Chain length 484, copies 4
């Protein structure tokens, strides 16, 4: 029986959810596609159902969004910012139950569910101010009576495909900035976080509707691969922002390129921690633990490879091993819990596969490697030593808590090994020259680099230069005017 | 027999050119691939020969470039700017003979050959100033004692593929900006402008060498589709800048995307729109020079002219009278305006296009024929009477054919122009301010360049990183 | 008897006001200086009393503010932005009663009282986003191993002196930006709007105190000229932002310069409207009316000089005259009212003086010129013709609704006349070349220029380039680091 | 008899200098004020003479400048940039003789005289690039159909008052930026560097004239305190840039404030701080060259050196050994490091300062005496043993006297340095990262320039305006 029909989960109704929900929103609510049940990963119990988009729903929604755009694009950017502000406030009002839904359906612990909603609120607060800054310079020409104008216009319809592990804030970032830039949006979320997508969309729909704006400015089309593929191939989707697996992302990028569209791709993270001989172990150990096992190893920023100098390799592993033992496991909505379940049963199987492959490729499981004996999708946070940095499994996209540990003897080889990889790098050392080399041209090619950083989400590290990220959701033109 | 073996073309030797030239430079000169002979399009005579890159030449050049990068990337951006400045100086010193080579091998008129080199000179001066602006903000972290640094680093090796019609300045732009950004470069130009590529590379090579820098910072691998494809597929080429045809460009972009690399693509069917209230003394000369400049072979060349029906006949008549005064001649002839098409195939394509235009109901009101003289000369051509969506008027083909269209409403002309995909520029003539705002604004043209009555580029060649660093109420120690 | 002791004005207590209020806040509330009564300008009735700062209060407050700065400056700018956000929300919660207080004590109509509070809220919303953007570039040196860093630091203590006519939002703009920039503030408001200053400070004090921050980050020292002079002369006040009369402002600027301090001065506005022969009279007439008589002619942006082409001079005057007749007069808190009283009795006397001086200098009063026969400080909105553009009275700082009208025959002379003046210019014409000349180097030297603008406060027109206004509240250093 | 009438100084004529020169330029050359003779500080011989501006000369020059501005302000910023570029070229062509004049009249060594002209050349190149960046954003209005344009306009006439110690480059900076920003300029330099002011103005005047521009765009009125005061009080001078002494600067700023004009003031007592963990191989040469460069007459000259007590004696001893090797000579002597003070009064002030330092308990550990040779030569000087707040060590006086102070704690040395008002720069030597962040951050130095172990400027010359313009659901018409 459905969790939403059970008394203690009645709070789900505060988000407008019921036993069976419409997964399409374009000003009207609907859904003639496949009905999907989403499950609570902490106990494998069905929560509720969502009627996903058919192809016809998708087609209709795109047309309605492009119609809404005609209205929305004529609304001054600061007034668009005000709408985004109101979205932030509406999320604020529901931050506790929406956070609880994130922990329930997705599986991250409560303060991260709530904190992810907070990131969306923060982004809205930011966007209101940003909306006053959207524009380019007028420069004088070398020609008398001629003006040179850098003009920024909305791209039109921004398609947004998001992943299971951040099922609120990635949409939120894309949506807040796309909106202030004068675009309409169409969202296809992970099918296993459909209730979350529906709930967020209900909050946004109310703001739009209260402001007498067409709902399709923020359209939703819940669905699986066919819907995502349709968006990738749709010339009416002027910009496709995709976040998710490397394999699907590659195919999305190719489809967009084939039609000369624009895409923004945020793909898989095989992130490294490097601890040099002179590292502060009091910093290294807790930072590595939270980076590796936080959100059950399912962040795009999750530490999956730990390089340790051979001199301190054993001590650091021994302390991580003891630390892993003390991780508090349970339901993710229990405030005491630090470690919840993996998102799906398939995830647990992928985890088991990876662990076997690591062993066969020479690795030793010095902690974990196994499924926990309890309801839900619980696996032991896992540590593997002995592999070469070259090992195929260590460079396999697996959203599971498996930490591959590598020894190194000097700066030379460990820099080289990491340069062989093509999201974030974190180093621990007191050698300033070493830090400058790693931050400079010869170092990591990662978009995110941390230096001696001890262990809310750090959205500030994922923001073009400075505040110019809005330019990614607009198109530039150079306009030359002869007013002579 | 080769022009470069004739006394009157001895000036070619001032560029270090010989009867047969090495088309590979990576610190050393070489080339073990196929020889290519390039021809002057003004008389179809062979100029000289270039030995192109083999696959092995390519592989070795990439390796040497990546080795040079270890040295180049360590040089502070302003110092790299000074190298680029010296390149501009070296170009300036050879501007007359290099310009003449551009005119001789490619076919554009001398003032434009020289002008294109001058454009590269100006780019170098621009790049020097830019080189002191490369950097990012330190932002405050929300966490006390932590700094957020926005760091910019070179991407590494920048591959540059260029086209025949601007065989100097497009490379120049990519090379100067990529250089100040701390990248090494690898150039593959159009096979039919190989001598120009060699000559430019010789000038740059001398500057590098005189500064005791490794020459592979500005590497050359002359070749055709094989070399270009290798670059597109090569994981060692961190960024591929391609300029050229949409067909080839798409395949390049796809290949780059297949390996998660970065590409810059510059691939346009430019339109001019004259509304009823237009100043025709602006419209007619603008249309003419945009249509026939460089014999219709620019990426910005005007190929479609929309005219309000009330003024359509007059503007066409005025254009015809002005076209008749176009001064045709060899690229080096004083005061000439109009030279040859780049190739014999261009001439065939031109004739094809004219035939198709008549077949689809169009009228040739001016030109349309090959000129009976040596070289690849065709009459600059005007076609009326075609429908706006007629397949021949959207065909990407570098020929001086201007297709003219009537319109009644602002609404319909905007509609017609907004169903062209990936147009490069749109130029409008009108005195209606409201109309201008409509055309420039969100519901208007989608073109990247818009004309009315006529500094962040370095980030394209670098990679950004966000770097976070750690910098009873009483602090003891 | 005091209005605050009368039943219908009990809403004043929602702002924490009582019969006698402390006018000093520095973490503690106090005031050993002169007690002042402020009056309702609509009826001359006393509202309540405020105990202003003594010199000793002032000295103590400055020391406490500089102590608070040691704490405040160590708080990350984005966290400072969050405090400013909360101030915005706290103002929001009290926007109706605070707006009503502005209409009561200051005298502008209710939607402007409320709207002025809204401007402060808007500025706070803006500042939260701005706080993430505070910083300068790191550039590479020509010298290997050397970094060039543009560093921004708070100036320290920012003294803020404001005027009667915008007794909330000018402080608010200065305070919001100064705060995110890591400064502490000290406020001295107009003595005749002391209750407003006290109320705003109570709202801010609560936010600071709830966040366990020292209250002196946002200090208040109510007082008259001696307090303002002390601030001007105080080397501990690193930046003095002054808004008010030209005469006092000049003296403030000189005192600051004498001690090599920094000042920001916003002084008197003798603003012009120019209507050319080809102007849209349907735009000109209502725009001139609201610009001239809005807030009873007491804005820094108030239109005081109207240049009309001789061809349309008479029609435009005749229509303004008819329009003035239909202005709805009454208590400014009455939602129906468009036109309230002048702020003080002295203002009414200044008004009478100006009108007499205009007559003696050759001018004709074609409408108004007189005091209205009713309780409070009501004068007739006034129109004067016949003066030369040269007339001394027409270039006299008088916050009164007097509109001096001038004829001109051509663009030449009217541009010249205006260039003789050294805040805002508004032109009405269809001649594009004319517009470009007036906007360009040869035109107005005003900081604000409007073109055919028809008639909430336009804070966007009072914002250095773009969003760089925060630099005015910080000090720049160029730091050269040798990390080689 | 005048140096310029001697054969060996005939090179002065290459600058258009004569026995007596006009010190007013406003399109025409003139000067009806007092004649001044300037002297070479290396031998106290008269060089040549300049006829300065009378009040009437000043009044007429302002009028002519404001008339020139009507023309100049209409020229597009990039075109104004090109004029500035040509000025840089013209300076470069005379760089050797103009540099020698700087050395001859002002007294800094030749490599620095030439170097200062080179600085002006470099500024001109910088300004050319800046000239294409002058502009503001169009921002969206909150009101539909309305645009917010940020407009920048020239302020009009920029007055420039400069000092003796950098008699070329300070004017150069102000002039080049003010010019590209569309302003006209009026220059009054130090009376004792009048010949330098004339020579620079002759170079600029020729560029303007050859471009058919009115010469008053770059006007000159040579004079003293009377002319400077007139500029400060003159409502027609929209912006007054003053560089010089704090005493005079304050009065200038006050006079400008009295008339609601704009001023830029550049008025410093620079400190060096060596902590216990400092690299002394960095400290000693840095301290020496910063202390004695230009015989101690830069605005950046090191006058206070704080040394941790543990290393104080060693650093002092090392400085003394290095000071003894300073190569003293005439400014034109090859390989020399140290020339004369600018004036005889500077020498008197130096002797005064040395006496006062001993009187207040200081010890002269090196130098302290006049050198017994022609000209205004004094020994570069080191004084130890004084208290940090001793009145003589904070006196603004351009002399090569380095005051040395001991300290024990970071806390006390920071305290001592933070009770100096309006210090220009602070240079620290230390390997402690935490200490650096403390010194660079909000609780650290208040100096505008901070050194560790060693593009928005155009808006200063313009005025900003915010310009708002107007650009059943169905729209009819
Ligand atoms: C990785 O899991 C990841 C990447 C980016 C974000 N954002 C920025 C778009 C939302 C805060 C979240 C998570
Ligand atoms: C079109 O033919 C075209 C495009 C771009 C350029 N550049 C910029 C890369 C060189 C001036 C030239 C020609
Ligand atoms: C004039 O009365 C005036 C000037 C400025 C402001 N501001 C900006 C500081 C507050 C909105 C208000 C009124
Ligand atoms: C100090 O003597 C000093 C200050 C400033 C300058 N400039 C910039 C105006 C010229 C390089 C020189 C010397």
């Amino acid at each position: 029986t459905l969790l939403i029909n059970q008394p203690q989960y009645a709070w789900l109704k505060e988000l407008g959810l019921r036993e069976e929900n419409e997964g399409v929103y374009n000003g009207s609510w609907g859904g003639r596609g496949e009905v999907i049940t989403t499950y609570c990963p902490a106990n494998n119990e069905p929560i509720a159902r969502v009627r996903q988009a058919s192809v016809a729903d998708y087609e209709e929604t795109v047309k309605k969004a492009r119609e809404a755009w005609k209205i929305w694009a004529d609304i001054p950017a600061p007034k668009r910012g005000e709408i985004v502000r109101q979205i932030g406030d509406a999320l604020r009002e529901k931050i506790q139950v929406l956070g609880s839904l994130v922990s329930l359906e997705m599986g991250k612990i409560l303060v991260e569910g709530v904190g992810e909603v907070q990131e969306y609120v923060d982004i809205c607060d930011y966007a209101v101010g940003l909306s006053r800054m959207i524009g380019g310079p007028i420069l004088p020409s070398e020609r008398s009576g001629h003006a040179l104008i850098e003009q920024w216009n909305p791209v039109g319809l921004v398609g947004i495909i998001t992943a299971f592990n951040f099922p609120v804030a990635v949409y939120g970032w894309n949506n807040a900035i796309a909106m202030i830039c004068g675009n309409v949006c169409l969202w296809k979320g992970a099918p296993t976080t459909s209730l979350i997508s529906v709930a967020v969309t209900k909050i946004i729909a109310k703001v739009l509707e209260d402001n007498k704006l067409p709902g399709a400015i923020c359209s939703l089309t819940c669905g699986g691969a066919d819907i995502g593929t349709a968006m990738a191939k749709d010339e009416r989707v002027n910009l496709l922002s995709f976040t998710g697996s490397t394999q699907v992302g590659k195919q999305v990028g190719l489809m967009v390129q084939e039609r000369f569209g624009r895409s923004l791709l945020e793909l898989g993270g095989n992130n490294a921690i490097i601890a040099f001989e002179d590292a502060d172990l009091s910093l290294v150990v807790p930072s590595a633990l939270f980076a590796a096992v936080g959100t059950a190893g399912q962040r795009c920023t999750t530490a999956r490879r730990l390089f340790i100098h051979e001199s301190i390799h054993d001590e650091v592993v021994n302390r991580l091993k003891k630390a892993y033992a003390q991780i508090r496991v349970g339901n993710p909505w229990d405030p005491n819990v630090l470690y919840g379940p993996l998102h799906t049963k398939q995830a647990v199987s992928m985890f088991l596969g990876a662990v076997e492959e690591a062993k066969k490729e020479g690795g030793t499981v010095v902690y974990g490697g196994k499924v926990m004996d309890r309801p839900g999708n619980y696996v032991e946070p896992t540590i593997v030593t002995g592999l070469g940095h070259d090992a195929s499994i260590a460079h396999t996209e697996t959203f599971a808590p498996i930490l591959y540990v590598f020894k190194f003897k000097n700066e030379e080889e460990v820099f080289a090994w990491n340069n062989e990889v093509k999201l974030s790098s974190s180093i621990f050392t007191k050698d300033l020259g070493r830090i400058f080399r790693w931050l400079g041209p010869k170092g990591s090619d990662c978009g995110i680099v941390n230096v001696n950083i001890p262990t809310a989400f750090g959205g500030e590290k994922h923001t073009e230069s400075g505040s110019d990220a809005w330019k990614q959701y607009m198109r530039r033109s150079t306009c030359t005017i002869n007013y002579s």
